[PDB]
Design an enzyme around this catalytic site. Sequence first.
Site, PDB file in Angstrom:
ATOM      1  N   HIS A   1      59.942 110.596   4.279  1.00  0.00           N
ATOM      2  CA  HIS A   1      61.033 110.068   4.390  1.00  0.00           C
ATOM      3  C   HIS A   1      62.185 110.574   5.357  1.00  0.00           C
ATOM      4  CE1 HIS A   1      65.198 109.129   1.562  1.00  0.00           C
ATOM      5  NE2 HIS A   1      65.427 109.029   3.076  1.00  0.00           N
TER       6      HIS A   1
ATOM      7  N   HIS B   1      69.026 100.227   4.893  1.00  0.00           N
ATOM      8  CA  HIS B   1      70.084 101.714   4.525  1.00  0.00           C
ATOM      9  C   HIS B   1      71.030 100.804   4.573  1.00  0.00           C
ATOM     10  CE1 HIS B   1      72.036 105.175   4.029  1.00  0.00           C
ATOM     11  NE2 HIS B   1      71.143 106.048   4.224  1.00  0.00           N
TER      12      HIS B   1
ATOM     13  N   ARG C   1      76.987 107.458 -10.624  1.00  0.00           N
ATOM     14  CA  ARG C   1      76.151 108.162  -9.157  1.00  0.00           C
ATOM     15  C   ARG C   1      75.098 108.669  -9.827  1.00  0.00           C
ATOM     16  NH1 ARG C   1      76.130 108.201  -3.696  1.00  0.00           N
ATOM     17  NH2 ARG C   1      73.735 108.833  -3.079  1.00  0.00           N
TER      18      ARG C   1
ATOM     19  N   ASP D   1      74.537 101.949   4.110  1.00  0.00           N
ATOM     20  CA  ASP D   1      75.271 102.273   5.316  1.00  0.00           C
ATOM     21  C   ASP D   1      75.350 101.653   6.856  1.00  0.00           C
ATOM     22  OD1 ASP D   1      75.392 104.568   3.640  1.00  0.00           O
ATOM     23  OD2 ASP D   1      75.934 105.435   5.639  1.00  0.00           O
TER      24      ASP D   1
ATOM     25  N   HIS E   1      80.336 112.747   0.748  1.00  0.00           N
ATOM     26  CA  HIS E   1      81.164 111.088   1.105  1.00  0.00           C
ATOM     27  C   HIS E   1      82.748 111.484   1.315  1.00  0.00           C
ATOM     28  CE1 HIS E   1      77.083 109.043   0.141  1.00  0.00           C
ATOM     29  NE2 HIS E   1      77.734 108.078   0.038  1.00  0.00           N
TER      30      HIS E   1
ATOM     31  N   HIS F   1      65.264 112.039   7.892  1.00  0.00           N
ATOM     32  CA  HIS F   1      66.040 112.238   8.876  1.00  0.00           C
ATOM     33  C   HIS F   1      65.665 112.996   9.894  1.00  0.00           C
ATOM     34  CE1 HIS F   1      68.806 109.612   5.820  1.00  0.00           C
ATOM     35  NE2 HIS F   1      67.720 110.081   4.973  1.00  0.00           N
TER      36      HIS F   1
ATOM     37  N   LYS G   1      63.468 100.507   7.990  1.00  0.00           N
ATOM     38  CA  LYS G   1      64.846 101.312   6.973  1.00  0.00           C
ATOM     39  C   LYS G   1      65.504 100.612   6.291  1.00  0.00           C
ATOM     40  CE  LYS G   1      65.829 103.903   4.235  1.00  0.00           C
ATOM     41  NZ  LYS G   1      65.759 105.524   4.433  1.00  0.00           N
TER      42      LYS G   1
ATOM     43  N   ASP H   1      63.649 113.745   1.920  1.00  0.00           N
ATOM     44  CA  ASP H   1      64.948 112.934   2.591  1.00  0.00           C
ATOM     45  C   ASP H   1      65.737 114.333   2.625  1.00  0.00           C
ATOM     46  OD1 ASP H   1      66.935 110.887   2.904  1.00  0.00           O
ATOM     47  OD2 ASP H   1      68.264 111.090   0.142  1.00  0.00           O
TER      48      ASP H   1
ATOM     49  N   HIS I   1      64.181 107.538  -3.229  1.00  0.00           N
ATOM     50  CA  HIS I   1      65.203 107.828  -3.948  1.00  0.00           C
ATOM     51  C   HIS I   1      65.131 107.275  -4.866  1.00  0.00           C
ATOM     52  CE1 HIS I   1      67.790 106.435  -1.807  1.00  0.00           C
ATOM     53  NE2 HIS I   1      67.850 107.061  -0.677  1.00  0.00           N
TER      54      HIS I   1
ATOM     55  N   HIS J   1      66.728 101.413   1.009  1.00  0.00           N
ATOM     56  CA  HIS J   1      67.588 102.360   0.523  1.00  0.00           C
ATOM     57  C   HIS J   1      69.370 101.441   0.038  1.00  0.00           C
ATOM     58  CE1 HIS J   1      71.195 106.163   0.326  1.00  0.00           C
ATOM     59  NE2 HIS J   1      71.653 104.584   0.131  1.00  0.00           N
TER      60      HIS J   1
HETATM   61 NI    NI Z   1      68.509 107.179   0.999  1.00  0.00          NI
HETATM   62 NI    NI Z   2      67.542 109.436   3.539  1.00  0.00          NI
END
Ligand code: NI
Ligand code: NI
Lengths: 79, 238, 569
Positions: C136, C221, C338, C223, C322, C138, C219, C362, C274, C248
């Site tokens: 995981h 995600h 959350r 977003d 965020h 990034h 992936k 992550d 996660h 995700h």
């Molecule tokens: Ni994620």
């Molecule tokens: Ni992530």
Amino acid sequence: KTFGKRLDIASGTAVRFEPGEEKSVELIDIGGNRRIFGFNALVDRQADNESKKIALHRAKERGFHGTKSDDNYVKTIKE
Amino acid sequence: MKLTPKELDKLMLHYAGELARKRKEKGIKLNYVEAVALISAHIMEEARAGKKTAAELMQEGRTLLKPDDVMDGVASMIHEVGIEAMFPDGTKLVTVHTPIEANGKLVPGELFLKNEDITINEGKKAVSVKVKNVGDRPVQIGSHFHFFEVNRCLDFDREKTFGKRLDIASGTAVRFEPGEEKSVELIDIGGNRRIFGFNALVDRQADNESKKIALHRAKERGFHGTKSDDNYVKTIKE
Amino acid sequence: MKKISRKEYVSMYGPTTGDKVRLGDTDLIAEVEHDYTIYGEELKFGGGKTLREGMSQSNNPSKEELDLIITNALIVDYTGIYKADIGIKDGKIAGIGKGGNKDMQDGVKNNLSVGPATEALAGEGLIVTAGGIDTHIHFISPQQIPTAFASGVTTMIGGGTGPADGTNATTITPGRRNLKWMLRAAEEYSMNLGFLAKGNTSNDASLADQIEAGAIGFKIHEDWGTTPSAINHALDVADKYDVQVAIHTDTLNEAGCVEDTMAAIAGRTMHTFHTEGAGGGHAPDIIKVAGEHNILPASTNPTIPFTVNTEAEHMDMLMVCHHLDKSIKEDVQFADSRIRPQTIAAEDTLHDMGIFSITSSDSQAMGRVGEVITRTWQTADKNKKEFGRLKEEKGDNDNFRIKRYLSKYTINPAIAHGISEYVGSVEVGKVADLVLWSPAFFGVKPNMIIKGGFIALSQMGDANASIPTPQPVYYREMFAHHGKAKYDANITFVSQAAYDKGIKEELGLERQVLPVKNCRNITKKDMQFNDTTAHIEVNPETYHVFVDGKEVTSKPANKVSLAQLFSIF
Ligand code: NI
Ligand code: NI
């Protein structure tokens, strides 16, 4: 009434709906070529009156609330 | 003459049997090869004579050699002699089953087994389902078939059989005669429980979510004993 | 025939069968299960010792002569906890067992022959594990790679192009050109690398092109939009190309809830990041998918173990990433749905039960790339403190729990991403990615990293000192880290399709290039020591978690092991 539409709010903002919450929102027409792909695979084609019937039928078959597509639906050659 | 390879092989076999018969006449106890060849050559000659049917020869192949005519151990090694012979009506296969009876104690390859039973599918709980064949044709089901997807003419509570197979010995089967009704034991399918094929009723991971899709597909395709509730809600991928 | 006291024997050659060793400053106790040695024939290197010409180094070696041998190593692997010698030949693990010279010693097989071409590495009193695998990542900064390397991680799988906002949120390397950028940048590093593509599209051709361009999977995600349509299309393409999919999920429930996502997955293999949901996911009940057969559930290290400072830290972190405001009730409602200290508490116990199977990072996206292994062992220590010794133990040890938690970052991620034929365990035939641990520092600070059969990183004193031990000692790049040697020691994982099209030669890559395989036919049952499937229910109101009808929770820890005893900061 919401087919081919999006929320008339600031770009990148959102509207929240709490469980049991009831409120009214503003919807504007989607711009550009009005080619709707993804999101639930309910349209995945050009947005227009002919495709609104297909979308309504698909939504009713998949249990989307507030969807009232008339019975005796006539299928097309590509669905 | 225009002899074929088959004719050359059969001529060799005939003379192997002739040698076996000569040795038997001399009083020698025949071994495995000699006994096999003697039976085969006798059957071929009888079929050439054309006075007997193939079934008669299958029965007659068992009277050629008495147990005292062969060596110890020979009888237990000859399970079946097959020979293709040409009758007046063409080529037929004649097989003689257990032509010679055992009289000694020598058993080549003898198996000495423990007297304990084997427990198969240990740790798997078996349910019992009653099944009836409402069709007019026999149906036979193997040990590892996904029992949910058997012939649509079989009627039983399909919902209870999803993700299951027969709790029987591997490679065995259960038969259902037309109109026959009987109960069977079903255990859960093991491994990853990824069911692909068999009627294309699942073709995905087996679980409660996919059991609804399978039940709906089974009902649409007329599988008996399938009761999937009306007002079915489709998913995005069906 | 002579008698040797256990104390002096262990001081000379390390623990033997029946001995037990504490792991770090935790309460986990490892017991040596078996020993491959012949008592009186141990391999020792030094002046006047056995590893010399004609005694333990052969003067007539076999043709499978070793390049490197690790003597008297305690192997901690999912396959067992035992003492052996590890032989390395041509970047692979050539043998595990006795090792030595057949001319002078009895039980030496041809694959464990020590000859004049063999280097000696002493492992007495040390632990050998496989290199960690972090799935995981990034790829936000290259400096993450040395940080993860120094903690015991030898493979990083993830996506990104750098400190761009898309990468700060997602582990996605989008498109052929960006894949080429990252694949050519990868030639720099001492790490096994593989990259995930963008799965967030409904265009099948666009999905297929990324796989053929060298990505090992997708992936999805939120977003970039986690919709059922994109999930369905990405899974279809992945099944056609035999690559893994990571997801995700949609925290906002915009297109649907968790069951709609499971319906879109449609019983196909999926790796969930996660899964407890603090890092994102259907609020509040994404954690329920951790009981499904087709799901490979992973957790990120910021939520484990659950501590007194965890909830407030995660709340403030969420408010920052965020850009939320405390004066807006909708932002508060989002934040409360959350974080959920209930699911965070349940996550530790689910790790102890084997429901969660993978630990990951992550990294710099609410996760710490240099703490995956440390937080895994902290979670194991906390669970042993709370629930006691596992009932699957055989003896006065924690061997089963040790294997269960070690699998979470070594073998299970390798199986999940189709690389478990190369890395993930100390087994013969596999790539020699090995980590040396002193038991006092186990799980927090390793001794050295062996990469591709050569030493790539180690603790080291100052270069001008008369010996390697004096201060300051820190982790320094070794010779496998430099020059053209790093190309032989490191793998870039690609898809089978890209490998068949000559991605190595097309892009001019000098690292080893290997294809991933067996990604689509694995389920939760393929995870070692973590294969527990169960019906998980989450209360929509109280956020309580029930496994098979019983409530699952853990209590927070006010102090953990392996934290302040070992680090200056
Ligand atoms: Ni994620
Ligand atoms: Ni992530």
